[PDB]
Amino acid sequence: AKVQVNNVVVLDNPSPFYNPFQFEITFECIEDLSEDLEWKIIYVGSAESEEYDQVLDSVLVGPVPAGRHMFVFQADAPNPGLIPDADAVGVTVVLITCTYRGQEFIRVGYYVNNEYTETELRENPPVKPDFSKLQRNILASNPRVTRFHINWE
Amino acid sequence: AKVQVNNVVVLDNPSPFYNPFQFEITFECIEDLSEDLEWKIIYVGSAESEEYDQVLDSVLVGPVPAGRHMFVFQADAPNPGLIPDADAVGVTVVLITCTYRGQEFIRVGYYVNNEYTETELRENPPVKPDFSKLQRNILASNPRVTRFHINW
């Protein structure tokens, strides 16, 4: 692999559901890259179907010379209108992927717990989720990191 | 494989739930490694989901010259606040992994039995687990050892 992800620091966590995602990403480039790296933040709106995935942001990083690199990757909150009611409250997943020449080489996944903070709403959740009262808590202590063999050319 | 794990001796076993893990690890290096070896101790807090894993400790060993090596790998107890009530009492697993150049080449797995030693607690287990009264017993007689092919 020409690119190695050293760490992902989860920032502004926990946060209100409507607040942006912020990740500080540190990566090492073993040798100069002529093309760009494409990073994405993907929110899994529903464990039941990939139909509910939302690409929250996508960014091109490059040209990338050899050495250690850092950047803050920000993304707006998911659109609640595309989240099924049954999945809104409870645990879901947020993904950070990076591709080089259309090929995914790394996937970082975090479990995300969306819950009410009010004892009232927690015990008796409304049928129609109240997103303005939901707190997103990314489980930053447990990053799930997957690497994939790709053609670095 | 440039690294071969010869044995893992489980120490301070059984122990109270809050006591640290202690493993004596012996391994052989076939040739000098230019990179570090990364060892981890991972507690599976729940058979139902990887969300409940606790990396208890992580250590960098290196540069590693060719030959025999031994070290004691210690790790603090898992955080009980992150363990689901349904998984606390009964069987779970603990893992020991080692990576080279970020590639996992060995995974050693042990079944762990967490039970009460007190008769009244054993017969009538509380709804909210009493971690201060649980005994952890690692099944040291049955190490499950998985080797993976990596790029050395």
Binding site: N7, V145, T146 | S49, V55, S58
Partner: peptide, 25 residues
């Protein structure tokens, strides 16, 4: 089931054809 949900989320985290590890790091 509740377990099926967990397995579905784990599959989304892992994708396919790779090696998933806890941490970087």
């Amino acid at each position: 089931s509740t377990e099926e949900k967990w397995a579905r989320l784990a599959r989304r985290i892992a994708g396919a054809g790779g090696v998933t590890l806890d941490g970087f790091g």
